[PDB]
């Protein structure tokens, strides 16, 4: 109830998002299930947190209380347990919840009852688990009513835990776009601002699947001295926000698809992580072993170079 949020950020450090699993629609529909060894593989390698998205949305009651599945709550905190067993620091949140998106008003009274259930179950587990509001807001849930949104949710998380640092993304799709829009209470003084990035777009998502047009940017490549100085000009950006609206910085996603050069994916790699770490940002890879992955769960062996570049 006096905790700094730029002292979590630090407990947050280097980190990596276990994808594709907890937020696909039934865990394992996208490839990933999260098995307990995991956490020591992570461990061992050197970060200091995992990301885990979660669709919450999908586990709970689509009428009044908006109860969350039984089975499902069991897992998420087996998940989160068998992290915070190896020393890991945790992040959750709430990820891939699209009707919200489409119909913010429609959905508000779920979303702040799935946090109000969040909050209550985890509000005395460890204060090295962080609960990130919303996974990319975006569409007709515009800029300025997820700043309506996220105050809402601060004051329903924080009428229930005053102790867990809370992660805050932006609007757009969460990315540089909408950050000089977003406004965080001045009364909430314990949370972290987060962004995601993936810019050049193009690059990092050529031929995604799941991105309409994709397949036009297959191909590109990324490392010219003219590419670095676009992404410093865009962190800067970030880093004054930082500066001037005083919040700490956590990139809680990045990470080129793997339909990219594999050089160009490591150079566009180590070159945000030296950058973000120049600006003090924690961080989380994207993703853990599968599309953007970095490891091979059935051969459980890592990519050394992609690996190296993240540390
Ligand atoms: O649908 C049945 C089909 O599913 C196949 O799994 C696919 C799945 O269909 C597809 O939606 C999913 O796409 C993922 C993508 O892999 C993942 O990297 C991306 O992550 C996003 C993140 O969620 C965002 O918030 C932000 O961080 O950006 C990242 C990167 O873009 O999310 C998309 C969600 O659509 O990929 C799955 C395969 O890995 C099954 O494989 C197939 O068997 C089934 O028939």
């Given at each position: 109830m ?8 630090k ?5 990596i ?7 696909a629609?039934?865990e ?7 098995k ?26 689509a009428?009044?209380p908006?109860?969350i ?7 998420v905190d087996?998940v ?12 959750i ?5 699209e009707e919200?998106m489409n119909?913010?008003?429609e ?5 702040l ?5 969040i909050?209550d ?7 090295t688990?962080?609960?990130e509001?919303?996974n ?14 996220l105050?809402?949710?601060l004051k329903?998380?924080r ?9 805050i993304?932006?609007?757009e799709?969460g ?5 000089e829009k977003?406004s ?13 990035y993936?810019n050049?777009?193009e690059?990092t998502?050529?031929?995604?699947e ?15 001295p003219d590419?670095?100085?676009h992404?410093?000009e ?9 500066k ?10 990045f ?6 050069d ?23 890879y994207?993703?853990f072993?599968?599309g953007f992955?970095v490891?091979?769960?059935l ?5 050394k170079?992609?690996?190296e570049?993240?540390?």
């Amino acid at each position: 109830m006096g905790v700094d949020p730029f002292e979590r950020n630090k407990i947050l450090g280097r980190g990596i998002n276990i994808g594709n699993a907890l937020e696909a629609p039934n865990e394992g529909d996208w490839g990933v299930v999260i098995k307990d060894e995991f956490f020591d593989i992570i461990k061992e390698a050197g970060f200091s947190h995992v990301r885990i998205p979660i669709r919450w949305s999908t586990h709970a009651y689509a009428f009044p209380p908006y109860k969350i599945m039984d089975r499902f709550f069991k897992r998420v905190d087996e998940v989160i347990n068998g992290a915070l067993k190896r020393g890991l620091a945790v992040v959750i949140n709430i990820h891939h919840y699209e009707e919200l998106m489409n119909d913010p008003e429609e959905h508000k009274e779920r979303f702040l009852a799935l946090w109000k259930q969040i909050a209550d179950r985890y509000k005395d587990y460890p204060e090295t688990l962080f609960f990130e509001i919303l996974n990319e807001p975006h569409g007709n849930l515009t800029p300025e009513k997820w700043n309506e949104l996220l105050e809402e949710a601060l004051k329903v998380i924080r009428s229930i835990d005053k102790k867990h640092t809370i992660i805050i993304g932006t609007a757009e799709w969460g990315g540089i776009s909408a950050l000089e829009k977003l406004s965080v209470p001045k009364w909430e003084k314990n949370s972290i601002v987060t962004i995601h990035y993936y810019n050049p777009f193009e690059f990092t998502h050529q031929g995604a699947e799941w991105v309409e047009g994709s397949e036009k940017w297959l191909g590109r490549k990324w490392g010219s001295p003219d590419d670095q100085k676009h992404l410093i000009e865009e962190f800067n950006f970030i880093e004054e926000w930082s500066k001037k609206n005083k919040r700490p910085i956590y990139i809680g996603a990045f990470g080129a698809y793997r339909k990219a050069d594999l050089e160009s994916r490591i150079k566009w790699t180590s070159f945000v992580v030296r950058e973000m770490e120049k600006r003090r940002w924690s961080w989380a890879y994207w993703e853990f072993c599968s599309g953007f992955g970095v490891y091979d769960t059935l051969r459980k062996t890592w990519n050394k170079d992609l690996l190296e570049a993240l540390i």
